[PDB]
Design a protein around this ligand. Structure first.
Ligand SMILES: CNc1nc2cc3nc[nH]c(=O)c3cc2[nH]1
Ligand SMILES: CNc1nc2cc3nc[nH]c(=O)c3cc2[nH]1
Ligand SMILES: [Zn+2]
Ligand SMILES: [Zn+2]
Lengths: 358, 358
């Protein structure tokens, strides 16, 4: 397999379906990446994660740079070996979860573009995120521009730190991140700068930070066409199933979110009829599975009623089952999306989905 | 399969190895029963429990009689269907975890022999425990005798409540429980009363309540020979691996304990070299599996170092992996015990085990 090769197999409007080939495996796009916070996709064995259909996971950098520390994980053979996931891993830069200066950030420890790229290397990341600044929402145009310009400078620093490590450069990919808040001209200048630097992929940063779905979609409308067509488009931190469907309709290829895991643990189950909270007393004697159509193992063997009991009782198996279901649901969503694009009926899928989901 | 048939295949001294055949499956003896507290073996899917080698589990009655309630579980199809374990289940009487009278116990609700047997029926238990009184330790001879006599009266009540329900009588088994504290004459009178009533199996109650291993073994020395030879002997709530080995040497066939699950969750891993606490910093970079010889999936794929990280971080996968390992270890212990008895080298196994374990 090549280091990185993104190929688009089919299109419908702005939507695309295809594959990213990497040394550690193939990634079907549009892709959902389950989130590994501290070297684990919470409450799931990696083989379970794979079984749900995930091709790649996101490893959070922030907690692991703390403990056990990037250097220790490197000593132990890297993140893949440590956690037992042998397929691609996208690592974030660790800066989003974190004294600000042009050099980088210091916190209660200094994190700069260079250190970030180094930590992602020590972890053995397949897809490395440039180190940026996620502009708070709302932002004045001046602040958004200052923030964006700093991010582009840090993007160039990222690129050069990555490229100055031959094993990283040869075996991993680097994604750049677009900023600009909700301002079209800043988004354009940022797309321009990132393309000039050149990356393997382009994320749309700065969204899903409180602007709400209408505003996010309005920004995506003009921002995604500004990115190189021939590379993957990653919408960081999104999101709800409906967010994902609209974002694919606007050209996004990749997604990550804690919603399916975190909200699973809290009792929220995704269904094609919309989300349910399994702790509600209405499920105490409901022998139906979480969802009527879901093909996951949880829906094949256990009832709402049992999972209701488990979550109410604080039992770990409740977290395990809810999470497996929710990640499986997300993967089934992405599969339906890929299939519908491949078959030229994605617009109809999107309408049908929303009608039933709501 | 018959309702209940215990057959002894081999002996060495007081030790026995054999099988209990029941409608829902075969139980290899000496047997360890993982504990299901509230319709779950904590942090494990039933298929994982089975995979470790368990033939039967113990379902705690106390929490489930609370919520969801025995009646609701019966409505939902019984405990086996609810939790997804289709093999035998031994249910306790619910009284041990719980205003005392000859009628039964009231608590913050009244539990009597009759209600207990009824709840175990509603749950659909394969092996039903008579409702007793576990005499506190230490106990004066007068108190121990009063307690024991009450338990024998409740044992007769148990027997008759069980027998007065035809589907229970036809499809499940009933075990009686011996009391008498540490007094040989009371233990004898209790064995006598239980045999006169007649049960499918006989538990040694009243131990593992603070008397310590020497005293427990001294009591077992005289108490187990008092029970019918041709029925299984169950030592309730035991125990540590060394406790189990000595108890088999004294004629016990069945065991349950929360140590492997509960202590697993707390960081304690059982090894043939003795238990370890994985949170100790000595394991932070130890790439060895929990145990050098263990055949479990956890030891096949993950390091001490990773599990160390997981437990320190409070991650659910840490509970999952520690528990699977520990239950697998317990099952491997019982297998070694069965094999050594079958081969007439159990006494040597016991010595070798203790030498290395300590
Ligand atoms: C959950 N929403 C959300 N998670 C994000 C992570 C991010 N990382 C780097 N850069 C970002 O702009 C950024 C924006 C984000 N929004
Ligand atoms: C953990 N020790 C322990 N768990 C027990 C459960 C019991 N149940 C019924 N009757 C008992 O005598 C009894 C004794 C016990 N000791
Ligand atoms: Zn499902
Ligand atoms: Zn093991």
């Amino acid at each position: 397999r090549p280091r990185f090769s993104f190929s688009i197999a089919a299109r419908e409007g702005k939507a695309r379906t295809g594959t990213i080939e990497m040394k550690r495996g193939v990634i079907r796009t549009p892709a959902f990446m389950p989130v590994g916070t501290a070297a684990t996709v919470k409450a799931l064995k990696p083989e379970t994660v794979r079984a749900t259909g995930a091709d790649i996971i996101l490893g959070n950098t922030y907690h692991l740079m703390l403990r056990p520390g990037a250097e220790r994980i490197a000593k132990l053979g890297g993140l893949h070996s440590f956690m037992g996931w042998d397929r691609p891993i996208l690592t974030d830069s660790g800066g989003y979860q974190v004294k600000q200066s042009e050099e980088g950030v210091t916190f209660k420890h200094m994190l700069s573009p260079e250190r970030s790229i180094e930590i992602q290397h020590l972890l053995g990341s397949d897809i490395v995120m440039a180190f940026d600044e996620c502009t708070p929402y709302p932002a004045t145009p001046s602040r958004a521009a200052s923030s964006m310009e700093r991010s582009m400078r840090w993007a160039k620093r990222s690129r050069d730190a990555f490229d100055s490590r031959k094993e990283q450069a040869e075996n991993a990919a680097l994604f750049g991140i677009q900023q600009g808040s909700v301002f079209e001209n800043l988004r354009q200048q940022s797309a321009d700068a990132l393309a000039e630097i050149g990356f393997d992929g382009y994320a749309v940063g700065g969204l899903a930070v409180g602007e709400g779905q209408d505003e996010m979609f309005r920004v995506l409308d003009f921002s995604v066409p500004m990115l190189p067509d021939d590379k993957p488009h990653y919408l960081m931190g999104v999101g709800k199933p409906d967010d994902i469907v609209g974002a694919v309709e606007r050209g996004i290829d990749m997604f990550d979110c804690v919603l399916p895991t975190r909200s699973g643990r809290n009792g929220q189950a995704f269904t094609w009829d919309g989300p349910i909270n399994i702790r509600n007393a209405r499920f105490s004697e409901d022998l139906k599975p979480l969802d009527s159509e879901c093909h996951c193992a949880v829906c094949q063997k256990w009832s709402r009623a049992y999972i209701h009991h488990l979550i109410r009782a604080g039992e770990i198996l409740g977290a395990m089952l809810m999470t497996e279901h929710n990640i499986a649901f997300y993967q089934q969503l992405m599969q339906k999306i890929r299939d519908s694009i491949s078959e030229g009926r994605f617009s109809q899928f999107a309408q049908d989905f929303r009608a039933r989901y709501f």
